[PDB]
Amino acid sequence: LLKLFTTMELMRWSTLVEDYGMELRKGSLESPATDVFGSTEEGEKRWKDLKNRVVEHNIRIMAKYYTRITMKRMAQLLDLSVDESEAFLSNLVVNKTIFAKVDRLAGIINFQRPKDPNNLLNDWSQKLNSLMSLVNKTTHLIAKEEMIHNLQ
Amino acid sequence: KIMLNTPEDVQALVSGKLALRYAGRQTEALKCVAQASKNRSLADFEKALTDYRAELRDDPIISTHLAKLYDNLLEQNLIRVIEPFSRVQIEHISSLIKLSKADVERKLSQ
Amino acid sequence: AVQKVVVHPLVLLSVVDHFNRIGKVGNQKRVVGVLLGSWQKKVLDVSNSFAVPFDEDDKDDSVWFLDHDYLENMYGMFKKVNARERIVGWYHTGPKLHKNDIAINELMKRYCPNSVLVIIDVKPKDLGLPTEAYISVEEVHDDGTPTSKTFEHVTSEIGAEEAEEVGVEHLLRDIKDTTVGTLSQRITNQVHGLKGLNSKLLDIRSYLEKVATGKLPINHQIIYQLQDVFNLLPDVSLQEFVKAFYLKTNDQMVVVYLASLIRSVVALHNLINNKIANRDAEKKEG
Amino acid sequence: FLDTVSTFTSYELMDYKTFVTYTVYVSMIALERPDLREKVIKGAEILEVLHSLPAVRQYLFSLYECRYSVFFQSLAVVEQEMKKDWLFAPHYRYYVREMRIHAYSQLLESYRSLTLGYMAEAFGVGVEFIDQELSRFIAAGRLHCKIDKVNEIVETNRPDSKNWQYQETIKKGDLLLNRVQKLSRVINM
């Protein structure tokens, strides 16, 4: 639950394979795991759509960061084929991936670098940066100027 | 009624015993059109325009409307797969529809 | 708790009265006045105030003289004539924050609610805003120092509601209103560099002095955020902002076309009347 | 010619079929695709009078369909019919060039880069002729930006929107500058 809470670090599910296996083996708690796998197809849909759900959720988490994870290398670190990653993109087109940038020559994707209208985006960033430097520069300047008065 | 994109009532009209006695080779092509509409397929609609063109050859002027439905589903597919792809291969995106780039390029550029 | 305060110029002109009723005695110390306001709403609004005889000692700083009967009588009569305003805090005219201000403010912390502190200058030579709202709240320090009274700067604005604007505007007859256009803009664009130059230049000298010649911890922790924010603009290469200069310069071109075209429209009546009036007045003069 | 609904066979000046045959040139050439789709394609008049001659339907659906392989094979009838007319002959040079540059701007509008294979197969003509065609239409035609042949591929940029959309007024700024110099010439005399 803590790994699924937030800031999901890219980890291998093989460590979770034995966790789920012993989750089916031990009967002290969470016993009805065989009842979760009761149906021949329902448990398979919950498992495939479960690993799919976390392999999409971690993409939704790393999509906030603009670090350019270079999903071409990520497909190599995840040890999976690029075809089911294109199917994952087929899940992203319904997952509202409209804010993205792809490349015809290479395979690197970009979740940022829009047309960047200078009257809205650079306007906003320059407003928060310049104004934040102005008022933040204003607070501790005279605040420290009042802190040095106690030395007399 | 198929121009307004409702194949369920088409199934309701071909499942009733009243209009079932007047069925024939004419309504089969309409069942393939409604099947391609509920399946959201394009090459299957071209198969309906290929095998049944010998009852689609005597089709009335509404053939232009049927071509408007074909080009409408084509427009939905184009705004479906191209919209998330800023820059992508023409064969990587045309391989899904397994159609040539001639008609697709002409309709797009048009 | 409180984000901003509103201080009317009536209390500062009452400090002008503090400097008027001295009587030429030779003391001119930090006369403490009882600040009044409206603590009901989240924003603080000072309407008026009064004073109390306050005298300190020459050598010992811990000497402070206040009065409870005068405060309850002036506040009682003032509440009898106007019950919409109550006690909030106090203020001193001294430019330096002395150590005894924790004991002076502590009395109005016990008897009165949380009092705000305002430091002003005895001589109106400071170009900056004379009013600084300092809230009297205790804050936890990360270094482990014991909890003590801390004066955090609260932003302040000098505004008048209905009448003081009219009275000030009539008594001055020299100040100008907003008057958007050439003069009110270009004056700010000329003297603004001195408005920041006297502040920064006046601050970083004693700052750099207290860097090497400083002890008695001055909260060096905030200096890391100081130089951090100062290093948050590491001389951008302006590469991405070129198109923004094309946008602002394109708006400049729009102002060029508006000025040239509109002034060219204004030249009509002048460059027509100059001829039709002169030649007709000349041909009809005699 | 928008009032063609009320027009009728006028044996005095020109027959109705001759009026349509004469307005199909100014309408077919002097109008773009939105103008045709709004005026004539939406109107039922050309839908009524297209059944008289099957050629006009070919010159309208082939031009609107951007099929040059049949439009150039059938364009000889427009060339021969364009001349040998009372009032329509001396202008035969303008309709040809204007229609060719209009079609080249039509195809070149939605196309940024163009290889010589798809172009030669689309137009059905040798590359040696389109070479001097576009070579003469860069300076003479003045339709788009400079063309390059470093890869033997028609590749244009057309930065005519962002900066040139604002630069469309600099001509009136310079002519207006000389006109206010004339305004300075009116001074004192």
CB contact under 8 A, C267 and D183: yes
Q: Residues C67, C68, C74, CA angle at the centre, nearest 5°? A: 95
Which one of A137, A141, A147 has the shortest CB-CB distance to C218?
A147
- In sequence order, which residues have a C-beta less than 8 Å from that of residue D104 and are 6 or more positions away? D133, D134, D137, D141, D143
Residue (of C119, C153, C165) closest to C5 by Cα position: C153
CB contact under 8 A, D166 and C253: yes
Which one of C153, C216, C247 has the shortest CB-CB distance to A142?
C153
The 8-class DSSP code of residue C38 comes to B
SS (H, E, C) D118-154: HHHHHHCCCHHHHHHHHHHHHHHHCCCCCCCCCCCEE
Which one of C98, C222, C232 has the shortest CB-CB distance to A144?
C222
Residue A21: C-alpha distances to residues A79, C69, C191 (Å): 21, 81, 75
CB–CB of C37/C18 below 8 Å? no
For residue A107, count CB atoms less than 10 angstroms from its CB and return exposed for 0-12, middle for 13-18, buried for 19 or more.
middle
Tell me whether strands D113-115 and D153-155 are parallel, antiparallel or unpaired.
Answer: antiparallel
Contacts of C264 in chain D (CB under 8 A): 176, 180, 183
Tell me whether strands C49-51 and C116-118 are parallel, antiparallel or unpaired.
Answer: unpaired
CA closest to C153 among chain A residues: A143
Collapsing DSSP to helix, strand or coil, A81 comes out as: coil
Q: Distance from first CA to last CA of chain B, Å, rounded?
A: 28
Q: Which residues pair with D113 in a beta bridge?
A: D155
Collapsing DSSP to helix, strand or coil, C117 comes out as: strand
Tell me how many residue pairs between chain C and chain D have CB atoms under 8 A apart: 14
Q: Please identify which residue in the block is written with the tokens 């027009």.
A: D7
Tell me whether strands C49-51 and C86-92 are parallel, antiparallel or unpaired.
Answer: unpaired
Which one of B81, B83, B88 has the shortest CB-CB distance to A104?
B88
CB atoms within 10 A of CB A92: 19
Residue B9 dihedral angles phi and psi, to the nearest 5°:
-75, -20
Collapsing DSSP to helix, strand or coil, D83 comes out as: coil
CB–CB of C102/C47 below 8 Å? no
CB contact under 8 A, B87 and A98: no
Q: What length is written for chain D?
A: 189
Residue (of B70, A55, A121) closest to C243 by Cα position: A121
Which one of C219, C225, C247 has the shortest CB-CB distance to A118?
C247
Is any Cβ of chain B less than 8 angstroms from the Cβ of D61?
no
In whole angstroms, what is the distance from residue D118 CA to residue C162 CA?
78
Contacts of C230 in chain A (CB under 8 A): 137
User: Dmax of chain C from CA atoms?
Assistant: 99
Is any Cβ of chain B less than 8 angstroms from the Cβ of D110?
yes
Instruction: Measure in Å the smallest separation between the Cα of A131 and chain C Cα atoms.
Output: 11
In whole angstroms, what is the distance from residue A72 CA to residue A107 CA?
6
C-alpha dihedral over C5, C19, C172, C130, to 10 degrees? Answer: -30
CB contact under 8 A, B110 and D66: yes
Tell me whether strands C4-7 and C116-118 are parallel, antiparallel or unpaired.
Answer: unpaired
Tell me whether strands C116-118 and C86-92 are parallel, antiparallel or unpaired.
Answer: unpaired
CA C79, C81, C83, C87 torsion: positive or negative? negative
CB contact under 8 A, C257 and D173: yes
Sort residue B49 into left (φ over 0), alpha (ψ -120 to 50) or beta: alpha
* Side chain identity, residue D153: I
Contacts of B109 in chain D (CB under 8 A): 66, 110-111
CA closest to D33 among chain B residues: B110
Could you tell me the resolution of this structure in angstroms?
6.1
In whole angstroms, what is the distance from residue A52 CA to residue C170 CA?
75
Residue B14: C-alpha distances to residues B9, B19, B24, B37 (Å): 9, 7, 11, 16
Residue B91 dihedral angles phi and psi, to the nearest 5°:
-85, -30
- In sequence order, which residues have a C-beta less than 8 Å from that of residue B71 and are 6 or more positions away? B107
In whole angstroms, what is the distance from residue C74 CA to residue A1 CA?
64
Alpha carbon A84 to its chain's center? 19
Instruction: Measure in Å the smallest separation between the Cα of B106 and chain D Cα atoms.
Output: 9
CB contact under 8 A, B88 and A92: no
- In sequence order, which residues have a C-beta less than 8 Å from that of residue C199 and are 6 or more positions away? C127, C128
In whole angstroms, what is the distance from residue A120 CA to residue A127 CA?
10
CB contact under 8 A, C218 and A143: no
Q: Which residues pair with D14 in a beta bridge?
A: D10
Which one of B81, B83, B86 has the shortest CB-CB distance to A101?
B86
Q: What's the alpha-carbon Rg for chain A, to the nearest Å?
A: 24
Contacts of D111 in chain B (CB under 8 A): 109
List subunits contacting chain B, requiring 3 or more Cβ pairs under 8 Å.
Answer: A, D
CA closest to D64 among chain B residues: B110
Residue (of C226, D100, D188) closest to A143 by Cα position: C226
Collapsing DSSP to helix, strand or coil, C119 comes out as: strand
CA closest to B90 among chain A residues: A104
Residue B93: C-alpha distances to residues A99, A110, B84, B96 (Å): 19, 19, 11, 6
> What burial letters (b/e) apply to D92-112, b meaning 16+ CB within 10 Å?
eeebeeebebbbbeeebeeee
C-alpha dihedral over D40, D42, D45, D50, to 10 degrees? Answer: 70
CB–CB of A92/A84 below 8 Å? no
Tell me whether strands C4-7 and C149-158 are parallel, antiparallel or unpaired.
Answer: parallel
Per the structure block, which two tokens stand in for B69?
């439905």
Which one of B81, B84, B87 has the shortest CB-CB distance to A104?
B87
In whole angstroms, what is the distance from residue C271 CA to residue C245 CA?
37
Alpha carbon D23 to its chain's center? 15
Instruction: Mark out the alpha helices in chain A (DSSP H runs).
Output: 14-25, 33-36, 42-62, 71-77, 82-93, 121-147
The 8-class DSSP code of residue A148 comes to G
In whole angstroms, what is the distance from residue B24 CA to residue B81 CA?
37
Per the structure block, which two tokens stand in for C189?
């664009």
Q: Give me the residues of C, 184-203, that contact A with CB < 8 A.
A: 203
Query: H/E element holding D155?
Result: strand D153-155
Q: What length is written for chain A?
A: 152
Q: Which residues pair with C35 in a beta bridge?
A: C49, C89
Per the structure block, which two tokens stand in for D23?
């307005």
Collapsing DSSP to helix, strand or coil, D84 comes out as: coil
- In sequence order, which residues have a C-beta less than 8 Å from that of residue D71 and are 6 or more positions away? D59, D62, D63
Helix axes B8-15, B25-39, angle to 10 degrees: 150
Is any Cβ of chain A less than 8 angstroms from the Cβ of B79?
no
In whole angstroms, what is the distance from residue D115 CA to residue D134 CA?
13
* Side chain identity, residue D170: I
CB atoms within 10 A of CB A19: 10
